[PDB]
Amino acid sequence: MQLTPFLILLRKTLEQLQEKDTGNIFSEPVPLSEVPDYLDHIKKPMDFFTMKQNLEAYRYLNFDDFEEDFNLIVSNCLKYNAKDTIFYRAAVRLREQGGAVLRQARRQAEKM
Ligand SMILES: Cc1cc(O)cc2c1C(=O)CO2
């Protein structure tokens, strides 16, 4: 496929995923100065701003690599936070609502 339409699709998909994060709790990196023990548990932090930078740096050339980093946003949050927290539930909700966005977007990628 052609790179330009694929990146346009990823930009739109990333915007749709960010729309499901209504609190914007995943918009920027987990602030390591405010969460000092975060890297003790989390091997690869991820967030939507970093994803946008990766997208524009041409680091997502297939849908799976894009989806892998989205999945890191979710899985890091499920790992770090206790189940009874808003953060944990927000990641579950993002997993659910984002899964539908990703399935539709991947179908569009496959038609390229
Ligand atoms: C996602 C997230 C955002 C933030 O601003 C602070 C955080 C988390 C955690 O997962 C724990 O601390």
CATH number for position 70: 1.20.920.10
Number of domains in the chain: 1
Here the tokens at position 41 are: 């548990």
Q: Whose CA is nearest to atom 5 of ligand 1?
A: 30
Here the tokens at position 18 are: 């960010």
The answer to whether the CB of 87 is under 6 A from ligand 1 is: yes
5-23 exposure pattern, b = at least 16 Cβ within 10 A, e = fewer: ebeebbeebbebbbebbee
Q: What phi and psi values does residue 65 have, to the nearest 5 degrees?
A: -70, -35
Q: What single-letter DSSP state applies at residue 106?
A: H
Greatest CA separation for the chain? 45
Determine the structural domain holding residue 110 and report its residue range: 1-112
Residue 30 CA to ligand 1 center (angstroms) comes to 5
The set of long-range contacts for 26-32, using a CB threshold of 8 Å and a minimum separation of 24, is 26/73, 26/77, 26/90, 26/94, 30/76, 30/80
**Gap positions in the chain, given as the residue before each gap (C–N > 2.5 A)?**
none
**Resolution of the experimental model, in Å, one decimal:** 1.6
Q: Whose CA is nearest to atom 10 of ligand 1?
A: 77
